[PDB]
Design a binder for these strands. Structure first.
Lengths: 62, 62
DNA sequence: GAATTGTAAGCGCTTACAATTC
DNA sequence: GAATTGTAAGCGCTTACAATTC
């Protein structure tokens, strides 16, 4: 089973998963317009990230 | 940073990550010899799996 | 021929650097 | 030219099915 994800809102927003992950990661390098671009996307679909995927993927910097 | 992993013990054991993940997953489909094969590998290197990687990858069946 | 092992892809996410934009 | 977005790879793990083994 695959619920809503960054791929979905990224698709919605147009962008990639790299853009959404930024917003999901507190944008920063994502432009204000884009931050809203994906948040709006997240909102419609009801985007909920997974703490594990974030933990695992976030371990790249470790 | 990448510590000991299934890749390591899989390398050691002379198998794949699929074999080790089985043993890591309580072998079952892994032959007794192999179970020992990888456990021995796990032992030398001091293999410690990651609960997240297991949680994430374990969500495949979900 | 059935069980076990391998690719090989993905479970969802993260990111970085270069090209385009200004 | 610098910032932002895209591929694109992988952070560690899981698995399933076919060929070889018996």
């Amino acid at each position: 089973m695959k619920p809503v994800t960054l791929y979905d809102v990224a698709e919605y927003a147009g962008v990639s998963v790299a853009t959404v992950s930024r917003v999901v990661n507190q944008a920063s390098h994502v432009s204000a317009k884009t931050r809203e671009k994906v948040e709006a996307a997240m909102a419609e679909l009801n985007y909920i990230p997974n703490r594990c995927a974030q933990q695992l993927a976030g371990k790249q910097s470790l």
